Structure 1
Amino acid sequence: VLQRRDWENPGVTQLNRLAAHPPFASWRNSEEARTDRPSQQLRSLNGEWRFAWFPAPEAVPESWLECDLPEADTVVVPSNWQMHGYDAPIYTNVTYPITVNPPFVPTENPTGCYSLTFNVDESWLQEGQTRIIFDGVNSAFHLWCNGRWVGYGQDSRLPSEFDLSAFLRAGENRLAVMVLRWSDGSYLEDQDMWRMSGIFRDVSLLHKPTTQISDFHVATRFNDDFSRAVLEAEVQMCGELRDYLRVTVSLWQGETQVASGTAPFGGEIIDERGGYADRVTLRLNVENPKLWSAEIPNLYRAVVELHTADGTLIEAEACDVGFREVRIENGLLLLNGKPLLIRGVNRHEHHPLHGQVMDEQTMVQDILLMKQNNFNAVRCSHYPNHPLWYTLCDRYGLYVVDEANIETHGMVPMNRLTDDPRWLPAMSERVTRMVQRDRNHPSVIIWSLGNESGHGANHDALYRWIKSVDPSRPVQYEGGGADTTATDIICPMYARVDEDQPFPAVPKWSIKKWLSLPGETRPLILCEYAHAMGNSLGGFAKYWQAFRQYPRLQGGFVWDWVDQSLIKYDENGNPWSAYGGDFGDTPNDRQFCMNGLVFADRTPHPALTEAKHQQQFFQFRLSGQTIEVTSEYLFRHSDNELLHWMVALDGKPLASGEVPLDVAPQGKQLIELPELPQPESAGQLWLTVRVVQPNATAWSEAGHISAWQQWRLAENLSVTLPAASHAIPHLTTSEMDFCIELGNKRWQFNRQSGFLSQMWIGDKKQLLTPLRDQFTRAPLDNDIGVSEATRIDPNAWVERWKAAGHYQAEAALLQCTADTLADAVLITTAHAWQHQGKTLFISRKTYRIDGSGQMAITVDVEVASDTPHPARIGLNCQLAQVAERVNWLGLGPQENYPDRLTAACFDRWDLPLSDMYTPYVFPSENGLRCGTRELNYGPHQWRGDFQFNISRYSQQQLMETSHRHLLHAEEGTWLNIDGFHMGIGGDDSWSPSVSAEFQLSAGRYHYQLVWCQK
């Protein structure tokens, strides 16, 4: 066993492992099978095991096979051993975590030795077959039972089963399992995720009788309009064939039996030598079946019984059946004859405390949040999931892409192993065992051959294998340029809507152009788009506009669902969120492990609301007084839907109402609004509509909002003058300062810097820092890309801004003058920002302080045409005071940016100061609100047309701090008020992705603010 080194040989992937099959419980009662009750024949071995860690498999003492080591600890199974402190988890994206030298692995190969002592019932050993099932072990393992060697397995993400009938004794039995971190199977598992190890899914014992059901498959066929179905069930047995053996398949809808069939064994003739004596095929007719879809997940229950002709049951098995048909016809992917639009997301199995151990409670929480945010589909990135996941997607309704555990991203070239016939055996076990496990699940609609492994002849061979054994689902594969002969669907990753990226050999065309290339007929579904790393999803609306307009663009899967951060503890035992490199792991890919729409504890990022709104199932159009509502449901009528409408004048409600929705799938409804009020007061009128679900569902509460939209109606411009004040502000001119007094208010302008340096109400100072121009932001993850201090990427935005001096530029005063008018004081300033003799920006300002005590600020900025476009053009200061609440009239309530603001609505918003900070784990610019007309904070009020952010953290502190737990609140409050702000991008995060219409490239800018004390 130490001399064969099976873990360094790609030709050996298992020894003594049993055939793959759909999930079995071996019920001995037909009613228990029908109702899905727990089976006495399936025991869990999850719980406390003994565990010892070793640096290599040669360091494991020989006594460990016979008895427990004294130095072993007690640990919970399932678990990852890096989550218990035995060695460090490693976060690496592309580079393999070991030397690339296939098929050898390091001689330092951390080894986990697990053991369990357990009782077996007397009844289990007299008759039948006892097997052990390991649902997942990472990465390869050898198994012993009572000191004797049983078998060996590889592939971390599919179950491994072994017959223990010959090894078990009555009384106390002992299992010993030796798990290796690295194996030749590690070469095929280079997914972008934490690299961990252990017995990380369930362990169980199953008892079957000697004559047994060994496999069964369920298939459904329809007539042209889905009014008649045939359920075809193939059953195979093992053991001794007898003439008295019979198989019955019955189909249940709730407690009503719908169809039934019975036959003896013996298939029809297949070839010159006969047929399968040990198989049978039943056909069951079903009239007007209820169809399964993500909108209405109607399920039936199929029970399969092996019994004698005189009626004695031997064993029963069962599964959930959904009647649906998936096909590609004339370049469109169809479900039940209608074209799908995929609102998809990629999801990893990740928990911040338990690593890669999934429980039911976590899975249900992810499914409810997905459906509540208008997702209908999920991609298993990038391996088969825990078996309970597919059951939940069947019951709640999500389309699943099921993916083989094959990724060789770090190879050079990427197809070095997948073009080699010596690795064809290892790859075929990963594809064929996934299909034999999952082919009965209705939620699985597409198979995938894996991810990022180039294009090799091995992929073509396996594409054709699946089409032949399971013709009822399309196959997709992205490697080798996303449109090879190994895919039914064009499935690019990160292709842009309008812009081509012409890389050699593997170009990423714009998605609209890809469709129409000479010869191309397939549908296009992006397997990854809109990389959600940090403050991201800019330009998301542009994908959804294209998906709705082009029939053959059928949607895509966002990258991705949840941040893969882990929890660490500081000195005081306070938890904090950690990422690549925080465990001493090296090399590592730092914060690239956090790409989620939700934080690792399942709290939402602000981008989640942008996804929910673009993916809505109702679309709205306004024409005069008429709202047109269009349904994008394919199958359901809107029977749980109420339309609420509200008209408001600059935040104040004027009229409201509700109307029930009655709209057929893909239909329209016209709603006529009552004669709207005509107010005399100035301001913009706004109409907001929202779709509300009055009743609770399996996945949502009563009152859930599923869709919304907002429009401008009539506007009345203000033609009244400000009330003529009696008091005149007084100007005092020293050598150092201009000082303006009016009543208890006082303003001070510094004549050497040319900035407002202080302001008094009574005797209380209002500023800690002067009001100054600001042209920079703390860089987002999309601004940095793959750039680092070792290896600078000169094309990233942060690198262009640094090389040009934007972070270092010094303001030089050109002019600072004051003048008394009739009723006001006017201050005029000009500044130039320079770096090594080059002028980057010029700003010219006027400040007008009138008798009402208002200060009107006008700003004019010029930007040199050859400097990189600036991140923002605005003012900043640090206010002296801290208030509890922020009140504003503008887009809200959540963080919104110029290329991510469709989901935000214009209204009067009011939040505690802490909701104005988004706590991204990697700190950056955050919390901006756009389209704002008025902002109130303490005694201050700003009016204008601006974007702002307000918080306790300076742009400087956000840029210098790598983790959110290291930030500290500064004295007072930092306010940033911008006339203009650049987009955030997010098509990908490793190349510039801010579209030309969101860059500040106009050269001249103007904005105005009024600062008063109300």
Structure 2
Amino acid sequence: ITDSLAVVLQRRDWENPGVTQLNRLAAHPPFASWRNSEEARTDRPSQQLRSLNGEWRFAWFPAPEAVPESWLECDLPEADTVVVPSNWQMHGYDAPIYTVNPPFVPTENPTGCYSLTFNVDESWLQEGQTRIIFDGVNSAFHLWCNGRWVGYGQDSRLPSEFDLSAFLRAGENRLAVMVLRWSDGSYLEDQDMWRMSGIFRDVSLLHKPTTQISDFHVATRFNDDFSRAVLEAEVQMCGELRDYLRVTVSLWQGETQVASGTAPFGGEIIDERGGYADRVTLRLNVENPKLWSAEIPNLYRAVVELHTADGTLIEAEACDVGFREVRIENGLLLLNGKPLLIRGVNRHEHHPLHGQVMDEQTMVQDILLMKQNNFNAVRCSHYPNHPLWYTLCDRYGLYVVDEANIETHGMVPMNRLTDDPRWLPAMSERVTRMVQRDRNHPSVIIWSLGNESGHGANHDALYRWIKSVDPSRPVQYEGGGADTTATDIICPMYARVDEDQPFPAVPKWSIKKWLSLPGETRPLILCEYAHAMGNSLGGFAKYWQAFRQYPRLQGGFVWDWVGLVFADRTPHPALTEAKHQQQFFQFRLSGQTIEVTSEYLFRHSDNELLHWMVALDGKPLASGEVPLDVAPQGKQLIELPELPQPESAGQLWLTVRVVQPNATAWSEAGHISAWQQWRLAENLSVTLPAASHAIPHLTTSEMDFCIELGNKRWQFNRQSGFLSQMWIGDKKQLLTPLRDQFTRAPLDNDIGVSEATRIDPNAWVERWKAAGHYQAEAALLQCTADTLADAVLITTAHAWQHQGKTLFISRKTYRIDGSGQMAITVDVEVASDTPHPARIGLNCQLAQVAERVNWLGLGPQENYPDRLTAACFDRWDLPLSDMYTPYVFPSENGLRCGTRELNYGPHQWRGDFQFNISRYSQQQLMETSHRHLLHAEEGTWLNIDGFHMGIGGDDSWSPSVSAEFQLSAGRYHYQLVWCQKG
């Protein structure tokens, strides 16, 4: 018959771009088919919407033709049981893939055969229409019901609905879904993530009446000052048209109705032939509406009731309504008349352990973490999301960019399909069905046409379709240079603040220059910036300085939320930097006056308290709390009381922080939302050290210099020229000699795309390797020891040569005084023609392992020269475990900058340096592929650097360390004092 696999699979609908669906129902906003207005208003579960999620039978096949014909009737004997909302690659059938014939797919196409046996009550079959909704099926699938072919579908990221009324029988039924891994639709979903396949979203049964609401959308119009609003709702019905049918739309704020409207069907005159008989538009007037924003997500409940003129209800639908206006005026993106500043992040749908299956708890966890880190916007990264995601963004407050599932970055012209009219029907379905589904969500403020698909005529056609259908939202699209005619917003990927990248035919201008190009008037919001891969996000403060200064630079979306957090949602150190740069309160210090400027556009600071503190080298001296009363975009001047003026040496530090005393829906009581630190006044130390009566004693041999003072003793290797050992009592303190270090375990930004096959000569790590920085051998030039009147003087000079070329010269001075202290002064010369070294400092392996690391310096978290703004100067005490950052691919990590004193066990290091301390050496970090293969070493590895190169972050494939953070001075000096507990 024609329901058999041989007939159904003969036309190869998954290799035809002209066939994207068969017998699929129209797209629409979510429906629950409530038979009670009160249940619809309160969003209670509907008995007409039944979930088929649960245990299904599954069978895997190498190719679609390998599926036996008997599968259509009875479940296979070897078929196992799975939970249907899942990806079958997570169950170990074929290898998941992270990574051409444009219409055709390989013949070896893995096929997943799902089947479910379920019951249907007779009430559903006697009357009404029963449909099945597949919220997401990766690639393409064929559907059977009781052995009869139903339909076909593609576009994995949007729901596919089929009418099952003629197929369901009273009693027990069986569904058979044949999911293919690859189809012609895979060419439009060719992005970069774990590919995966299966029924990764919800499957449900919906029962609608014979006469039903088929579609509805709402529009909000406002007067000049937003004091009056009109809510227009257009309702479309399907089925038999009767003169006694009525539609009522009611607006509810909580439990009080604020507007209502009723009308029979029959719309306004459209053109010569007339108007829609099956449509009605209701206009509802709202006085002083509560506006929706990310700061204050005021939501109403709109209930759409289809009922008879007498008063009997047929069906009820409901949605949340937010009152807001989004438009671009004079080159600025305005929300409710105010210029938005986007604190955005890109977010893929990635479950911590279930792959691509999203559930409510993970979504709420993600939203809470974003808002607690001062994010106000999220970009739906390259496909429409789970329907519940948009509902949660309405309720908590998050601007959402909804993106069509179009992604063809693998094409060699990259517009080969988007400039081909034969692929226009395929791409139009992906754009139109997204708009039809999500147009009612207030959180969605911008439409996106896709990602990395070049620029073709299909983009222009689909851009104009959205503008015609929904003029209430701007349309953005990166592709073809991010400033084509198919975008209302210049949305470059990884454009830099000041440096231009003039690629042929698609230049990446600096964002400041991009704005002022001749004829350019649009606002600029970066769809992707600040690549957070590994130890990254250096120079993040540069972007937000530019965002504040330039009105038409309206923010951007940080790439990869999850990323800024690990898979278990553990935060990266760079998340703190993003939170600080994205604060809604800016601070200015002038004498004793703190100026607080609010960056909120709508809300008043009614949950805000300012706590200020003055400390001297980590010792608190005074503190106070002042309530915050700042209007949106206003300023509050806060005059501090008479601050302490200690006569002890040290630097005075003033720290302010904004604390929320009350808990919100997204934060708990005591939440810190903003902070800032300043230097107040420094008293330079002029006091001399105590006149120690003792003198260190120097012994000289042919192999070493030995300095002895009491129980302490130092040993310098005369052949190597480095301090080899130190003894307190009879206990050795070192396992590895203290030597100069000029390299670091390369970061992901240092490596770039330089694989072992496609080498990248411009990468930092390749230049360091070609210059011999990792292979340079130290050569002793001179080593002398002299006894002073109160100290012992050790002078050494080393040269680091690679293939007959001196790369670095280090001249070091060791001064061991009678008090036990050890002063180390280092002077380093770097050749100008060699690439700038990653660091200039010392390293050693301490024999002792201790539990706590105490230091007076910047930040509790790891920080780097270009990622230290969020860090604060104070006295920090952390366990040694927290001094190591567990990046997936091991690299240099755990650095703390601006440190004046470091304590570890009995050792104290004083000066002006950066340090990282851990159990893994830089050598081991460079050679270990994954962090689970890292093993702790015998002692503790300490890296103390006078100077350290900045980390990248503008992108991960090209060098992005700014010139002011490169070690290009040529000559460097730093001093260190090493003392003990005495």
Q: TM-score range by the shorter chain?
A: over 0.9
The answer (yes or no) to whether the contact 1:128–1:208 under 8 Å persists in 2 is: yes
Match of residue 74 from structure 2: 67
Q: Distance in 2 between matches of 1:879 and 1:260?
A: 76
Whole-angstrom CA distance in 2 between matches of 1:88 and 1:537: 32
Q: How many angstroms does 1:159 deviate by?
A: 0.2
1:606-647 CA-to-partner distances (Å, cap 9, x unmatched) read: 000000000000000000000000000000000000000000
- Aligned-partner Cα distance in 1 for 2:404–2:646: 63
Choose the corresponding residue for 2:16, options 4, 9, 25: 9
State how far apart, in whole Å, the 1-side matches of 2:950 and 2:865 are.
Answer: 6
* Offset, 1:910: 0.1
1:268 CA displacement: 1.2
Q: Give 4+ residue runs of structure 1 displaced > 2 Å after superposition.
A: none
Alignment pair present for 1:1001 and 2:968: yes
* Counterpart for residue 393 of structure 1: 393
Counterpart-to-counterpart distance in 2, 1:708 and 1:389 = 31
DSSP-derived class of the 2:679 partner: strand
For 1:926 and 1:814, the matched residues in 2 are separated by: 33
How far the C-alpha of 1:265 sits from its partner, in A, is 0.4
What is the alpha-carbon distance in structure 2 between the residues aligned to residue 32 and residue 352 of structure 1?
34
Instruction: Report the Cα distance in structure 2 between the residues aligned to 1:645 and 1:193, rounded to whole angstroms.
Output: 45
What is the deviation of 1:87? 1.0
Paired positions, count: 973
CA distance in 1 between counterparts of 2:758 and 2:599 reads 48
> Where do residues 820-835 of structure 1 align in structure 2 (5 Å cutoff)?
820-835=787-802
Q: Secondary structure at the match of 1:771?
A: strand
3-state SS in 2 of match to 1:64: helix
TM-score when normalising by structure 2 = 0.99
Look up the SS of the partner of 1:138 in the other structure: coil
Partners of 1:728 and 1:119 in 2: CA distance: 95
Q: 1:41 aligns with which of 20, 41, 48?
A: 48
Residue 390 of structure 1 aligns to a residue whose secondary structure is helix
2:65 maps to 58
Q: CA–CA distance in 2 between the matches of 1:765 and 1:307?
A: 89
Deviations 1:156-203 (A, max 9, x none): 000000000000011100000000000000000011110100000000
Q: Deviations over 1:441-465 (max 9, x none)?
A: 0000000000000000000000000
Identity %: 100
Within the candidate set 758, 776, 780, 1:809 is matched to 776
The equivalent residue for 1:177 is 177
CA contact (8 A) 1:647 1:685 kept: yes
In 2: Cα distance, 1:490 partner to 1:892 partner: 36
Matches within 5 A, 1:346-361: 346-361=346-361
In 2: Cα distance, 1:992 partner to 1:308 partner: 68
- Which whole-Å CA distance do the structure 1 matches of 2:824 and 2:304 have between them? 80
| Equivalent pair of 1:124/1:207 in contact (CA under 8 Å) | yes
What is the CA–CA distance in structure 1 between the aligned matches of 2:645 and 2:949, rounded to whole Å?
Answer: 38
- Partner SS state of residue 750, structure 2: helix
Cα distance between partner residues in 1 of 2:14 and 2:963: 52
Q: Residue by residue, what CA displacement relative to the aligned partner does 1:41-72 show, whole Å, maximum 9, x if unpaired?
A: 00000000000000000000000001111010
Indicate the SS of the match to 1:749. Answer: strand
User: Quick check: 1:871 aligned with 2:838?
Assistant: yes
Moved more, 352-361 or 659-668: 352-361
Deviations 1:62-108 (A, max 9, x none): 00001111010000010000000111110xxxxxxxx9101110000
Q: Are the aligned partners of 1:710 and 1:905 in contact in 2 as well (CA < 8 Å)?
A: yes
Q: Distance in 2 between matches of 1:766 and 1:645?
A: 42
Shift in Å, 1:352? 3.5
CA distance in 1, matches of 2:359, 2:641: 52
Partner secondary structure for residue 737 of structure 2? coil
Looking at structure 1, the residues matched to 234 and 9 of structure 2 have their Cα atoms a distance apart, in angstroms, of: 43
Superimposed CA distance per residue, residues 669-689 of structure 1 (whole angstroms, 9 cap, x where no aligned partner): 010111111211111100000
TM-fit CA distance, 1:3:
1.1
Structure-1 separation of matches of 2:268 and 2:835: 74
Question: Residue 133 of structure 1 corresponds to which residue in structure 2?
Answer: 133
C-alpha displacement of 1:351:
1.6
Query: In structure 2, what is the Cα distance between the partners aligned to 1:124 and 1:844?
Result: 88
Contact between 1:377 and 1:398, CA under 8 Å: does it hold in 2? yes
Structure 1 counterpart of 2:617 = 650
Q: Judge conservation of contact 1:246–1:265 (CA < 8 Å) in 2.
A: yes
User: 1:472 and 1:862 mapped to 2: Cα distance?
Assistant: 62
Deviation at 1:819, TM superposition (A): 0.5
Per-residue deviation, residues 300-350 of structure 1 (Å, max 9, x unmatched) = 000001111110100000000000000000100000000000000000000
* 1:312 alignment partner in structure 2: 312
SS in 1 for 2:862: coil
Give the distance between the partners of 1:838 and 1:513, measured in 2 at CA: 42
Asked if the contact 1:145/1:167 (under 8 Å) is kept, the reply is: yes
Q: Find the residue that maps to 2:888 and give its secondary structure.
A: coil
Q: Structure 1 residue 789: deviation in Å?
A: 1.1
Deviations 1:410-458 (A, max 9, x none): 0010100000000000000000000000000000000000000000000
Q: How far did 1:892 drift?
A: 1.3
Q: Does 1:449 align with 2:449?
A: yes
CA distance in 1, matches of 2:93, 2:600: 51
- Asked whether the 8 Å contact 1:21–1:214 carries over to 2, the reply is yes
Task: Please report how far the alpha carbon of residue 118 of structure 1 lies from its aligned counterpart in structure 2 after TM superposition.
Answer: 0.4
The match for 1:100 is: 100
Output the CA distance in 2 between the equivalents of 1:146 and 1:377: 46
Q: Which residue of 1 aligns with 2:557?
A: 557
CA contact (8 A) 1:115 1:176 kept: yes
**CA distance in structure 2 between the partners assigned to 1:279 and 1:912 by the alignment:** 67
Match of residue 740 from structure 1: 707
1:508-552 Cα shifts (integer Å, max 9, x gaps): 000000000000000000000000000000000000000000000
1:256 Cα deviation (Å)?
0.2
Question: Does the 8 A contact of 1:814 with 1:829 survive in 2?
Answer: yes
CA distance in 2, matches of 1:166, 1:752: 92
The answer on whether the counterparts of 1:79 and 1:357 sit within 8 Å (CA) in structure 2 is yes
Deviations 1:96-131, CA, capped at 9 Å, x for gaps: xxx910111000000000000000001011001000
CA distance in 2, matches of 1:406, 1:840: 50
Cα distance in 2 for partners of 1:418, 1:703 equals 51
Is the partner of 1:768 in helix, strand or coil? strand
Mapped contact 1:130–1:163 kept (Cα < 8 A):
yes
Q: Could you say what secondary structure the match of 1:14 adopts?
A: coil
Displacement of 1:933: 0.3
CA contact (8 A) 1:501 1:508 kept: yes
Q: Do 1:18 and 1:162's aligned partners in 2 also have CA atoms closer than 8 Å?
A: yes
CA-CA distance at 1:753 after TM superposition? 0.5
Whether the 8 Å contact between 1:796 and 1:992 is mirrored in structure 2 is yes
Contact 1:83 1:353 in 2 (8 A): no
- CA distance in 2 between counterparts of 1:808 and 1:369 reads 44
Output the CA distance in 1 between the equivalents of 2:918 and 2:280.
70
For residues 309 and 582 of structure 2, what CA distance do their matches in structure 1 show?
55
Distance 1:620 1:376 in 2: 20
Q: Any idea what SS the aligned residue of 2:390 has?
A: helix
Residues 922-951 of structure 1: CA deviation (Å, up to 9, x unaligned): 000000000000000000000000000100
Match of 2:855 in 1: 888
Give the conservation status (yes or no) of the 8 Å contact 1:342–1:555. Answer: yes
SS in 2 for 1:777: coil
Provide the TM-score with structure 1 as the length reference: 0.96
Displacement of 1:714:
1.0
SS of equivalent residue, structure 2 residue 699: strand
Matches of 1:625 and 1:257, distance apart in 2: 52
Helix, strand or coil: the match of 2:651? Answer: strand
Quote the Cα distance in structure 2 between the aligned partners of 1:824 and 1:26: 90
1:334 aligns with 334
2:552 and 2:756 map into 1 onto residues whose CA distance is 44
1:815-843 deviation digits (Å, cap 9, x = unpaired) = 00000110110011000000010000000
Q: Deviation per CA, 1:729-779, whole angstroms, max 9, x where unpaired?
A: 101001111100000000001110000000000000100010000000000
Following superposition, the deviation at residue 2 of structure 1 comes to: 1.8
